[PDB]
Design a protein around this nucleic acid. Structure first.
Ligand SMILES: Nc1ncnc2c1ncn2[C@@H]1O[C@H](COP(=O)(O)OP(=O)(O)OP(=O)(O)O)[C@@H](O)[C@H]1O
Ligand SMILES: [Mg+2]
Lengths: 327, 310, 250
DNA sequence: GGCCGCTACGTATCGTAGATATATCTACGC
DNA sequence: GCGTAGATATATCTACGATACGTAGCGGCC
């Protein structure tokens, strides 16, 4: 006879993700997808509106004590807080924190924290950093759609001090050309590249003919800041950044000691760094107001400042100011 | 071993019935079809359809579950690393209450199987919304195969040309996701096998042949499966079943599943009466009606004639 | 349910199955699928006409798999045969088979001899169904005749009357009317006993049986459909040989 | 054997009830 | 101080069912 006896018992595979495990686009590069664009992409992949998916799954995990079905028939602002809203949701705010935590738990993904700036909480001041209204680069969207590439909004577009796309040298457009209104970042249905109000198109060959060199340092520094966070491999330590700033201050002081003229070029930044080192270290520092000009005068990229260790940073500073020190 | 565990005699009747019901035997046709199906699954070779025919009771459902389980355990070592990676998906088609087959029900049931959240609410980013949701779910969840049991219910349409339009809709679902579709059904399946070049090229046909009484090798195989079923019957005494091989074949038509369910009925009847052996009248009590056997034989003969194209 | 229209209404069947199955105490909060079905203040579930039939069917599937009854009884199942398309009988039976399938619940159908229209209408339903014949009492075989005599004796012994009437003499008359059917005989005896109690008569006179008997036209129509179905439901050794011959097993 | 009339059925269409997009007033948090 | 959200009414779109009409297949007559 036949000795083979099959067994059809189930195998009990590990629990699957509640939502699709969509990869974030261009993580670690100056063109990383914003959390808002990722939310809209996940909603589009599920054939659900961002609002509807939000109260379907994120709201019960965010809003702890409510009836989930009764939450299914509300406005997005009840849990997002549209009184604030703004592209600042991409920042380091509390609702951003809990939203990122819930999203990472739902898809068991380990990179959504890089799609925002919670890794820089306590490091970079929130005020004066993010735009109030949605912005886009029409050339980017048109090129992406023509090349059959995924549409999304980079983090750089959410910053006030980023107004130009270095790829296309085009000033960011905050107003829909069709309806004339300015889109909020969060809406009931706002797929990337589309007008959240009139459903019109926002990608056109718009030419940028301004002095982009003025804002080049700011945009490149912010791009480096976004692109560097996923590559660190750890949560940054506040006093690490504080002591790097202090080391740059000491290098500045030694350079001034060697050359008196440099005091004229660096006095204001010296005073600002001294104040930032005398105030509480746990207090965040204003990114564009303090760190970017400081590393600019130090002739050091934001990537070099936040990435290199103390030895490399000290050696490069000494070489940059031609000092004879060796740490 | 050829014998059932000997401590099962002291156990209650329910335990013996359970041991018998979750026990299944591998006869040569079933294992051959299993190897062929898994070879096609591992290497689709550009074919998006693995249509499997067979008589009512050859073991189509059992083969489906076995393939699902084995592919699941083959994929298991890597599901810990990668999530949203359902290995295989197997659902059964629903006969429509209305005259025509319903596709909204098909799409929503497929979404239910994939644990799609907020299926009822949905939206259309442009049943088109349900179809797009199913396409996206198949693309992202990345299933290896897609079994659709009882594929004869697909052609519950009064239009002869829409009969292949059902498979046209399934095919349009398949291409934009590139997921293998291995449909299973009865002989009312050949009305869908190779219609049009699209379904004639990318479809691989597997026939779950039954055990016919003409070839002496098949007769010997049927006798051997009878012998192993007798030796695996959880009774105090082993009844002699190989002798009435003609009687067992008459009411089963060679379908191994029919033999299994008939023997399950007889064993349960014996256990309820606390009997120790199986009598001929015990088999006669729960035998299938002659008219029923005639009807299924006519159906499988017509199916074999249709599939006899060379 | 026999439908008013020419089509069997599957939506009504599904909602009636749901309401009949869902009648336990209020403690079970199952939370069925689909938004259109829920409980109420009085405990009886409500279904809106907006809900489509397949969604109600899916809710019934979920309820059946959760409750897991042993058997689903359907009386006068021949009402499934009210359609307009000739092939639609197979469609109805396939829908019922599919239903029972994913639910895994054995569906038992009880009906008259016209239920035989779905007997072996296809091989898949032919295998997955077994048939039980509720045969009446015939006349050619003396065994069923003696059984009918014993039933008549028991009924006449159990009649609440001062004098136990002799029902054994007119057994031919009772068989001619009741056609052996035990239920018809019981109803006839019920009518006769009610009349006797109205007259307070300590006995059942023959003419009393003729008062509440059935018209010969009714009885002839009874036996006309009974004999027609019996030959369809007759299995002989002749039907075995060709089956053995056709399979090559001869 | 051929042509005409009947009628059974599919189907386009239109009505109708419910979901919903949105505009507007008012309060409140930023 | 002003945005900005929340509530609500309302017509209008939309899904679904009922219905009358066109047509083709089939039965009847020369
Ligand atoms: N080789 C086998 N050994 C043991 N039991 C079997 C075998 N093949 C089928 N069965 C039994 O048959 C039942 C499963 O149904 P089966 O696959 O035989 O039917 P099918 O007609 O091919 O499928 P379906 O009706 O779902 O299309 C189970 O009770 C299973 O134990
Ligand atoms: Mg089966």
């Amino acid at each position: 006879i036949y000795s083979e006896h099959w067994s059809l018992n189930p195998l009990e595979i590990p629990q699957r993700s509640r939502l699709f495990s969509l990869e974030p686009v261009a993580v670690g590069t100056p063109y990383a997808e914003s959390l808002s664009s990722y939310l809209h992409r996940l909603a589009q992949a599920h054939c659900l509106t961002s609002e509807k998916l939000v109260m379907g799954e994120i709201a019960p995990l965010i809003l702890k004590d409510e009836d989930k079905s009764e939450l299914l028939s509300k406005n997005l602002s009840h849990l997002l807080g549209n009184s604030d809203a703004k592209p600042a949701i991409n920042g380091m705010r509390e609702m951003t924190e809990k939203l990122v935590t819930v999203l990472e738990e739902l898809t068991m993904r380990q990179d959504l924290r890089f799609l925002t700036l919670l890794s820089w909480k306590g490091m970079i001041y929130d005020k004066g950093l993010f735009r109030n209204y949605r912005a886009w680069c029409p050339c980017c969207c048109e090129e992406w759609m023509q090349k059959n590439k995924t549409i999304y909004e980079p983090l750089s577009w959410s910053f006030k001090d980023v107004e130009f796309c270095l790829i296309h040298k085009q000033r960011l457009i905050e107003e829909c050309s069709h309806c004339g209104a300015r889109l909020p970042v969060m809406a009931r249905l706002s797929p990337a590249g589309f007008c959240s109000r009139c459903y019109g198109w926002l990608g056109q060959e718009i030419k940028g003919e301004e002095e982009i060199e003025k804002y080049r340092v700011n945009i490149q520094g912010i791009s480096e800041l976004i692109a560097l966070t996923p590559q660190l491999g750890y949560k940054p330590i506040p006093i690490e950044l504080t002591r790097k700033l202090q080391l740059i201050l000491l290098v500045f002081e030694q350079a001034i000691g060697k050359d008196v003229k440099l005091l004229g070029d660096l006095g204001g930044i010296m005073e600002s760094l001294r104040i930032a080192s005398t105030t509480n270290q746990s207090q965040p520092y204003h990114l564009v107001k303090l760190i970017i000009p400081v590393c600019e005068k130090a002739k050091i990229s934001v990537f070099q400042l936040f990435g290199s260790d103390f030895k490399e940073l000290g050696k490069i500073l000494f070489g940059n100011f031609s000092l004879e020190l060796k740490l | 071993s050829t014998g059932f565990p000997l401590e099962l005699l002291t156990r209650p009747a329910t335990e013996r019935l359970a041991y018998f019901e979750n026990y299944t035997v591998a006869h040569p046709r079933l294992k051959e079809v299993y190897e062929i199906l898994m070879r096609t699954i591992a290497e689709p070779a550009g074919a998006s359809f693995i249509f499997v025919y067979g008589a009512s009771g050859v073991g189509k459902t059992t083969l489906r579950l076995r393939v699902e389980q084995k592919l699941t355990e083959l994929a298991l070592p890597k599901l810990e690393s990668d999530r949203a990676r359902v290995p295989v998906v197997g659902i059964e088609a629903i006969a429509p209450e209305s005259r025509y087959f319903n596709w909204k029900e098909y799409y929503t049931r497929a979404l239910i199987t994939l644990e799609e959240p907020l299926i009822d609410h949905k939206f259309d980013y442009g049943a088109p919304a349900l179809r797009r949701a199913l396409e996206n779910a198949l693309i992202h969840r990345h299933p290896d195969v897609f079994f659709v049991d009882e594929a004869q219910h697909f052609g519950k349409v009064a239009s002869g040309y829409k009969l292949q339009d059902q498979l046209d809709c399934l095919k349009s679902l398949a291409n934009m996701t590139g997921i293998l579709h291995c449909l299973l059904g009865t002989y009312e399946l050949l009305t869908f096998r190779n219609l049009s070049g699209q379904l004639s090229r990318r479809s691989v046909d597997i026939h779950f042949r039954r055990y016919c009484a003409d070839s002496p090798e098949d007769v010997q195989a049927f006798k051997s499966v009878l012998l192993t079923f007798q030796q695996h019957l959880p009774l105090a005494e082993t009844p002699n079943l190989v002798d009435h091989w003609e009687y067992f074949y008459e009411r089963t038509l060679g379908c191994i599943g029919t033999l299994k369910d008939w023997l399950k009925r007889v064993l349960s009847d014996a256990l309820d009466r606390e009997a120790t052996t199986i009598t001929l009248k015990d088999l006669q009590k729960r035998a299938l009606s002659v008219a029923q056997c005639q009807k299924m034989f006519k159906e499988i003969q017509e199916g074999e004639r249709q599939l006899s194209e060379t | 349910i026999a439908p008013e229209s020419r089509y069997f209404n599957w939506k009504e069947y599904y909602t009636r199955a749901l309401i009949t199955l869902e009648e336990p105490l209020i403690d079970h909060k199952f939370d069925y699928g689909v938004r259109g079905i829920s409980r109420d203040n009085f405990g009886k579930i409500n279904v809106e006409s907006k809900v489509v039939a397949p969604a109600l069917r899916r809710a019934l599937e979920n309820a059946l798999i959760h409750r897991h009854p042993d058997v689903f009884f359907v009386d006068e199942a021949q009402h499934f045969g009210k359609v307009a398309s000739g092939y639609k009988l197979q469609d109805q039976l396939d829908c019922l088979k599919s239903l029972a399938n994913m639910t895994g619940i054995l569906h038992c159908l009880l009906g008259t001899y016209e239920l035989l229209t779905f007997r072996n209408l296809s091989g898949q339903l032919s295998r997955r169904s077994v048939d039980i014949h509720f045969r009446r009492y015939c006349a050619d075989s003396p065994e069923d005749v003696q059984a009918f005599k014993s039933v008549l004796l028991t009924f006449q012994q159990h009649l609440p009357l001062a004098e136990t009437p002799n029902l054994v003499d007119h057994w031919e008359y009772f068989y001619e009317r009741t056609l052996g059917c035990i239920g018809t005989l019981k109803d006839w005896l019920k009518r006769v006993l009610s009349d006797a109690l109205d007259r307070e008569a300590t006995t059942i006179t023959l003419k009393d049986l003729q008062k509440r008997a059935l018209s010969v036209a009714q009885c002839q129509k009874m036996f006309k459909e009974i004999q027609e179905g019996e030959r369809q439901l007759s299995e002989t050794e002749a039907d075995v040989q060709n089956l053995r011959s056709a399979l090559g097993l001869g």
